[PDB]
Paper text:
VhChiP is a chitooligosaccharide-specific porin identified in the outer membrane of Vibrio campbellii type strain American Type Culture Collection BAA 1116. VhChiP contains three identical subunits, and in each subunit, the 19-amino acid N-terminal segment serves as a molecular plug (the “N-plug”) that controls the closed/open dynamics of the neighboring pores. VhChiP is a sugar-specific OM porin with the ability to selectively transport a range of chitooligosaccharides, chitohexaose being the most preferred. VhChiP consists of three identical β-barrels, each containing 16 β-strands connected on the extracellular side by eight hydrophilic loops and on the periplasmic side by eight short hydrophobic turns.
In this study, the crystal structures of VhChiP lacking the N-plug were determined in the absence and presence of chitohexaose. X-ray diffraction data of ligand-free truncated VhChiP were indexed, integrated, and scaled at a resolution of 2.40 Å in monoclinic space group C121, with a single trimer per asymmetric unit. The final model of the ligand-free truncated VhChiP was refined to Rwork and Rfree values of 18.0% and 22.6%, respectively. Inspection of the structures revealed that both truncated structures existed as intact trimers, indicating that the N-plug truncation did not affect the assembly of the protein. The crystal structures suggested that deletion of the N-plug did not interfere with trimer formation by VhChiP because the three subunits were held together by intramolecular L2–L2 interactions. The truncated channel inserted relatively quickly into the membrane and remained more stably open, with no gating. The average channel conductance of truncated VhChiP was 2.0 ± 0.4 nS, estimated from histogram analysis of 60 insertions, similar to that of WT VhChiP.
Residue numbers in the entry:
A (entry chain B), B (entry chain C), C (entry chain A): 20 to 350
């Protein structure tokens, strides 16, 4: 089976970095082509009862700020087995249990700069899509409770260049119109800024869908990092979204924030970020949507790593607003 | 739906750069594999009259002078909408209206070193296939007149690294056995050789296909560029082709040339290129062709840009002749 | 048609390089995803009797020690023609006749570090998968005898950076349960270590499949190299595998070795490698296999090239053992 998500966002950005030429370079109108094509299949082996599953998914073919061209396997690409009793196991490149909740619902619409890869903690707060991963997905026990658990090699280890690794777990419980979400991830042996780090990240959240057309989500996220020289860091964060759906339309407000980072008990000032976002979406077909989106990113003002050099954050390139229209079509 | 052009040229080149070791490296037999796989489709949205269209086309999988392997999205890759009243609008990565006519008919057979990316003018005479583009293609009004128009982001703007942009327009009129072609492209905020450039390129052409088996194309291209320091540059060029088609055979002579560049009113000597090409093509199948081809490229002898450094042209590597056989098949 | 091999090997390696941090870096658990997607087809041209053939095969989507993503055209990618009287001719990226026998059977299971790309001779003992190649595959004359022959450009020449080339031939003869194999490859104008090299490799080998469930292979490989400064080098090598297949199971022991390199008649001590490997395989489906594998790599201890610099070998990263399980599925 060939599948695909055809997705195209025309997005205008207006940057306020403090440098006008940089604002000219980063800002302006671009096309964010997140179209991808993938291949997947099942096969029932004659001599093995768990059903074989597999997927090979290409990357974004032309994202904004990037060149054309994606290879096959850049996104979720795996093999596995699935049973009605124990759910499914996947080996390969997949989303960590924590990141899947960070990405959805908590990064939509355009909150990712702050809540996905945003933040200021050292080490690696969590992986997102990670290769060299084994991931178990429980079935939805009693149609209300499921578990996601995974471990895998780190980024450096996947190149034979390190021994970083990570493990994570997430749970979901359905309670009436609500879903409750909790997740953990632990990153070990993370090499950065001349230190070896350990990261621990905890997430709790809630999601609601109501028959009057309101739906919403709220998430709290707590990140701790410990470096080998004794330094401890802490940063937490939140994301929330409110939606109203009526006929063929969805109205959505979203907000997400990282709070000031605390190093060794001391709060580093102006190390917070937040983003406010408004979106109108049109259900143009059961297989497609049209959307318009406007958002505002106010980033942190800078921070040094443990090597006395500037640590990179999603605010390094400066504050910016964004206006966009987009289409996404699934097949 | 999956489509493809299976394209294979076995090409022998004999260079004459003036350095025998460089002739040895650059010359010799190679296999130019321009085979490409693509994906496309349409979708009539329930709630939108213009039909949704999309395409994702992979690159040349193993061209000569390049390593193996191509990603999806390297060639024309877009979304868009179409309607019989107002035509087609495409967003993503497409051919500029000007470049399309430069490429076909005027670059065939093997005239592209001179007429396509050949030239000496500064800035960017035109884009060829460009991401971050919106392109309107009109219906063929009265089955005779159509309009291609496009604006897009520049090469550097595509990476958040600059603020270049461009706009282009082309028109075609069918008149008996003739087609009349005209095209403009203007490139802006082009950063090169220490300056910011504006380019203006104009093209006029004719094509004819006659019942006696003769067909032909002839084009004139006018390139002007102006630099931020006041320097003005001008270069013009021609391409022409003559075909005789009898039964399953087509014989073809092509010729193209860039004439001497003029900078601030003064002609720069020996800045011209020309190419003379001969080809025989066999219609081996309604879906495929075989061909043999020989061509002479005599390039310019060098020029400097406005940074007092050598400006790269397609002649930088030296003159060369080329004899080749090829196969193209379409599905 | 779309076809694929879905291949996943979870491999744990334990290195003994003599550097504990390198051992931690190179070793540990990885996922080796060699899943690959391809496209192939034939076409009967209306005006040409030999059937047109073509294939475009993608790379490994996520191999161990490598990043995710592969393009189309990274594995066997070609056009060609086939007729019954004379076999098939392919043009493009294919395996050389010598390499095809090195790889299968003589590299399985996991012998490749030693027998495939392993070794210490200078220049280029042979290509493996090579672009810019023309390869003829004879039919099986008298239902017992076939021939493979090929000529191609070199690694450098396919980028326009040299004039290396190569040619190769192989022959197979069926003798009851046996197949006899022989092959030759010659490489020319190989530029390495300040010299230009000529390589000559010869291979003889036997495969047998007996109805008792016993099968085996045994190969002897002889490698000669001549540098432009007069230096001669010689190294030979061996690969053997023993298999017992009963029911849905295949047991396998393999062994391969490169022996000490001789330079100008003098044996260079400790320039040998060998590998011993055991494997159990389960025919889980007519389309798929599960396997478990353990192997031990004992690599050479270093040598200099003719430029007084260390010559890279598959032992440069140091000795290692490896334990793994895998699935391969074909569609
Ligand atoms: C002697 C310099 C140019 C020689 C070749 C000119 C060919 C132009 O004719 C093409 C017209 O159609
Ligand atoms: C190169 C000589 C190898 C031949 C020895 C084996 C003979 C096997 O014959 C099979 C009977 O049919
Ligand atoms: C024609 C069959 C060749 C048999 C392979 C011989 C095994 C190599 O041993 C060489 C050891 O040195
Ligand atoms: C029917 C008896 C099979 C004979 C065994 C094969 C001989 C193996 O060596 C032959 C190649 O050397
Ligand atoms: Mg990662
Ligand atoms: Mg461009
Ligand atoms: Mg090679
Ligand atoms: Na810009
Ligand atoms: Na892009
Ligand atoms: Na799950
Ligand atoms: Na060459
Ligand atoms: Na190539
Ligand atoms: Na048009
Ligand atoms: Na060890
Ligand atoms: Na490691
Ligand atoms: Na990998
Ligand atoms: Na063969
Ligand atoms: Na020894
Ligand atoms: Na060793």
């Amino acid at each position: 089976e060939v599948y695909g998500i055809i997705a195209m966002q025309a997005a205008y950005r207006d940057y306020d970095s403090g440098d006008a030429k940089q604002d000219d370079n980063l800002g302006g109108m671009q096309l964010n082509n997140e179209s991808r094509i993938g291949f997947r299949g099942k096969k029932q082996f004659a001599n093995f009862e768990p059903t074989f599953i597999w997927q090979i998914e290409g990357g974004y073919v032309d994202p904004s700020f990037g060149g054309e061209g994606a290879g096959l396997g850049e996104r979720d690409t795996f093999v596995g087995f699935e049973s009605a009793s124990w759910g499914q196991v996947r080996l390969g490149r997949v989303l960590t249990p924590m990141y899947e909740l960070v990405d959805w619902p908590a990064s939509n619409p355009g909150l990712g700069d702050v809540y996905d890869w945003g933040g200021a903690i050292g080490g690696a707060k969590y992986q997102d899509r990670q290769s060299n991963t084994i991931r178990w997905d429980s079935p939805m026990y009693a149609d209300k409770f499921s578990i996601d658990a995974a471990v895998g090699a780190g980024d450096k280890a996947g190149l034979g260049a390190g021994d970083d690794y990570w493990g994570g777990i997430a749970a979901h419980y359905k309670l009436g119109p609500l879903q409750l979400d909790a997740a953990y991830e632990g990153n070990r042996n993370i090499e950065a800024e001349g230190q070896t780090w350990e990261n621990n990240t905890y997430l709790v959240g809630v999601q609601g869908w109501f028959e009057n057309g309101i739906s919403f989500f709220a998430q709290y996220k707590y990140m701790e990092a410990d470096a080998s020289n004794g330094v401890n860091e802490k940063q937490d964060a939140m994301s929330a979204g409110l939606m109203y759906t009526t006929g063929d339309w969805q109205y959505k407000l979203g907000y997400a924030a990282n709070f000031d980072l605390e190093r060794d008990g001391k709060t580093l000032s102006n190390t917070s970020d937040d983003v406010v976002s408004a979106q109108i979406m049109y259900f143009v077909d059961p297989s497609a949507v049209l959307y318009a989106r406007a958002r505002m990113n106010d980033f942190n003002e800078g921070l040094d790593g443990l090597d006395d050099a500037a640590r990179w954050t999603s605010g390094t390139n400066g504050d910016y607003n964004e206006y966009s229209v987009g289409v996404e079509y699934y097949f």
